[model samples]
Target: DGACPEVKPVDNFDWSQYHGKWWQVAAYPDHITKYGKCGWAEYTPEGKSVKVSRYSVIHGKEYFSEGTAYPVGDSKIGKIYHSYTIGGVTQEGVFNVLSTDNKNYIIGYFCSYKGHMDLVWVLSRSMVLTGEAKTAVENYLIGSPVVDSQKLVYSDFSCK
Candidate 1:
């Protein structure tokens, strides 16, 4: 019982299943999309890195941003570190693939950059999640050591 639990990502985590348009079904504790709607993201591979493009409507206006994410570990398995421009400044963040299937996924981000909050989002191909899928996301975030589950919010995402 002295052995430490393994925190490394699954080696079998398939990236092909992860590259596509995803809609935010839910978010945990004070997210950027609290007042936004029609949130979506598309991931594409470039060389050994990935390109991340996200879009949403904030304050009745549409907004979009693109960033580059490089896998941080030697294994390059489950997580990618990202850098993106914010208010004329570049900020760093982490995109962790906590859990996923072809239908949906749970992604976690800890933006250590000032003015941003650590967040976890439940995303799916559709705008809503099934009951079981919803529970899996809820339990993961709530059970996490970093997230404040009380601040979690759900998004109303339907691009008009």
Candidate 2:
């Protein structure tokens, strides 16, 4: 098997300020959302875990998925384990936060699918990403090994 170093997650991740609505600005691959449009996620704290509600529009239909997220080892670390149910089928996966400002934007990386499908999501609080946030995210992605910056696809909010 090919070797890929494990991407380190953000240290001392602030869970408190992360609760809110975040729009998907870009993703490593469009298939992560089934090539959907206007994708977004809502995070709500629930005790030691967080409630994850994901939404998108595909084929003129609204798609929704809900799940619970919790820390893997350290509560302050950005590594999260999620059990999400979509279309009555439930799946568990680990998603790690690579970077975040806790207010403007967040970058999440997922390689827990045994390297079969690595995913990355660039999210912002608003429908768009601009100014320093966009630049910072792009710069990070350009240097990241897990994601190919050129393959990243910007979200299409025209359906919203």
Candidate 3:
């Protein structure tokens, strides 16, 4: 059932307003992203695009994904095509922000290569989210695809 990605993208997304550091709080089950305690993402303003830089820990080791995320179709919408290299392998993925700032935090939906892989990430300006915010973020994945709802997990990230 690898057809279309789940979740509806929000329209009139202001990338500038959303720019800055977004710390990971919760995420749907994913093989690529296991348990990352100190995961975080940052977006820098750029020329018609956002400079992408993210770091996450997997198996006690830390790694970073750095590249560019470009907008796709209907520039006014919340859709992005991110390109980054990991271990000498260049990869591309679809990053859609659905109902962001809907709660006290932000939730981002992402998939790799036409839904070949997918997951939902809950982010916040800081490393913590209130109980209510956590629940709202979970609701964001109500209709997610390829995600084992029961396997959703949260992070314990704190900047030093």
Candidate 4:
């Protein structure tokens, strides 16, 4: 909280409002070394439990895998913990809510000690984020250590 702007404490964050499907606009640049340009993530709830599916572009095609998610605690303001296995590899990480309006948009960062760290995502109820909103999200992400905003590639889905 010194030189960097004060971020809203994770405890003050609202997690329930974040449950839904979201397309990955961009991630840390290093992801490009492992996968192609396309990437997306979705989160849905099933009887007090949540599931996450991450899709990445590989060789001009998309591949996906599913995982389970749970709240870190009983509190409504608690952080969300996600773990899943894809391609026979299990990845576990924490989704820290950076900022959100509960509907229009959300921004956060996720990382695991296992060498996966990136600006989480900027998601909307609809994938059709306004040009201004996209720019704002890119600006916010560029300030972080994840990825350079310039390398982010937009997808072609029509926001269904």
- Report each candidate's C-alpha RMSD, comma-separated, in the order given: 5.6, 2.4, 3.8, 5.3
Question: Candidate 1 clashing pairs?
Answer: 29-151, 29-152
Off by over 4 Å in 4: 1-12, 18-20, 32-36, 59-61, 74-78, 111-118, 131-160
Candidate rank order under lDDT = 2, 3, 1, 4
- Tens-digit lDDT track of model 4 for 1-79: 1233333424554556547567655444555446434556677778677777777766566668788977777535546
Winning candidate number (lDDT): 2
Give, for candidate 3, the lowest lDDT window spanning 10 residues.
29-38
Every candidate's lDDT? 0.64, 0.79, 0.69, 0.60
How do the candidates rank by TM-score, highest first?
Answer: 2, 3, 1, 4
Question: Cα miss at 15, model 1 (Å)?
Answer: 2.4
Better of 2 and 4 by lDDT: 2
TM-score of candidate 4 relative to the true fold: 0.64
lDDT of 1 by residue, 70-98 (tens): 86775336676788753366677666666
Query: Cα deviation of 40 in candidate 1 (Å)?
Result: 0.5
TM-score of each: 0.69, 0.85, 0.74, 0.64
Model 1: weakest 10-residue lDDT segment is 1-10
Give the alpha carbon lDDT tens digit for every residue of 1-160 in model 3: 3655555787867666657788777777573356355777788978888887888776767788787878888866888788886557787877787756543576667665523656677778767877776566557558555445576577755433
Candidate whose TM-score is highest: 2
